[PDB]
Amino acid sequence: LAKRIIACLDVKDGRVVKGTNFENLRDSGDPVELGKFYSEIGIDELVFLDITKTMLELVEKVAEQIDIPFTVGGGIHDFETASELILRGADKVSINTAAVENPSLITQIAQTFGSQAVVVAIVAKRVDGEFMVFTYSGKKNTGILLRDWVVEVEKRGAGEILLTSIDRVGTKSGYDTEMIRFVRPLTTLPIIASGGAGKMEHFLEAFLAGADAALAASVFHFREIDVRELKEYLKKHGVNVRL
């Protein structure tokens, strides 16, 4: 099964939170324009993340303009919101804090739209040598061990785990490959590595650690990595991608 490259677009009020400077692009803040561009250059999937209704309009336009899978995330707190996002064209929804506080939400979405529709995002940090699950964008220690939550999440019916290591996020220092390795034998689900990507070699390392997809925002936002070059590089180094 081919490894996937996934671009994460941070969105506020249905616009991309710029500093973008895509001169080739007409409007760097239009998420449909930016998403379509990524689609065309070889990105395999998109994640639209609301960092703060306008989301429903965004999903609508994205759905009819873009022909690759896309996930929506960021403050989905209930079944009704997930349902509405999926019906209006989102392929997947990502939930985190709302999954920790009501794990049945996972199962409710999976039963209604299929397991492949639910992505559970997990933010973990090291606390006294143990990986612990944090909610509220890394503000709250749930007291839940990463090793138990991963097992609960699959059991509840999740289709994928988006594995965010908050202490690598934005740093460009590499993915947290130790955490990916820790999670790999605990679950059979596809693991999406998230946070830290800085150079092509970092993607290789994440795939070697056992990720099935690698998500990045910084290196695609700051235009640092050519997607096609990245795919050729991974292929050259024995990683199965699609070209």
Ligand X SMILES: O=C(O)c1ccccc1NC[C@H](O)[C@H](O)[C@H](O)COP(=O)(O)O
Tokens of 16: 């991309």
Q: How far is the CB of 200 from ligand X (least distance, A)?
A: 13
Which is nearer to ligand X, 106 or 197 (by Cβ)? 197
Other C-beta atoms closer than 10 Å to the C-beta of 208 total 14
Other C-beta atoms closer than 10 Å to the C-beta of 170 total 12
Residue number with the smallest Cβ distance to ligand X: 218
Nearest Cα neighbor of 227 from 237, 238, 241 is 241
Which is nearer to ligand X, 19 or 238 (by Cβ)? 19
Which is nearer to ligand X, 115 or 218 (by Cβ)? 218
137 interacts with ligand X by CB under 6 A = yes
Give, as ranges, the residues between 183 and 212 that touch ligand X (CB under 6 A): 194-197
Which is nearer to ligand X, 26 or 190 (by Cβ)? 190
Other C-beta atoms closer than 10 Å to the C-beta of 33 total 17
177 interacts with ligand X by CB under 6 A = no
Amino acid identity, residue 83? S
Which is nearer to ligand X, 39 or 94 (by Cβ)? 94
218 interacts with ligand X by CB under 6 A = yes
Q: How many residues does the chain have?
A: 243
Give, as ranges, the residues between 74 and 113 that touch ligand X (CB under 6 A): none
Terminal-residue alpha carbon distance, the chain: 13
- By CB under 6 A, name the one of 216, 230, 234, 241 that touches ligand X: 216
- By CB under 6 A, name the one of 93, 123, 158, 230 that touches ligand X: 123
Question: What is the spatial distance between Cα 62 and Cα 19, in angstroms, rounded to a whole number?
Answer: 22
Task: Indicate the DSSP class of residue 223.
Answer: T
Parallel/antiparallel/unpaired status of strands 140-145 and 130-135 = antiparallel
8 interacts with ligand X by CB under 6 A = yes
11 interacts with ligand X by CB under 6 A = no
- By CB under 6 A, name the one of 17, 56, 166, 208 that touches ligand X: 166
Q: How far is the CB of 11 from ligand X (least distance, A)?
A: 11
Which is nearer to ligand X, 7 or 59 (by Cβ)? 7
Question: Taking contact as CB under 6 A, which single stretch among the options 77-85, 102-110, 161-169, 224-232 is the one that binds ligand X?
Answer: 161-169
The three-state secondary structure class of 74 is coil
The DSSP code sequence of 142-195 is EEEEHHHHHHHHHHHT-SEEEEE-TTTTTT-S---HHHHHHHGGG--S-EEEES
Residues engaged in binding ligand X (CB under 6 A): 8, 49, 121, 123, 137-138, 164, 166, 169-170, 194-197, 215-218
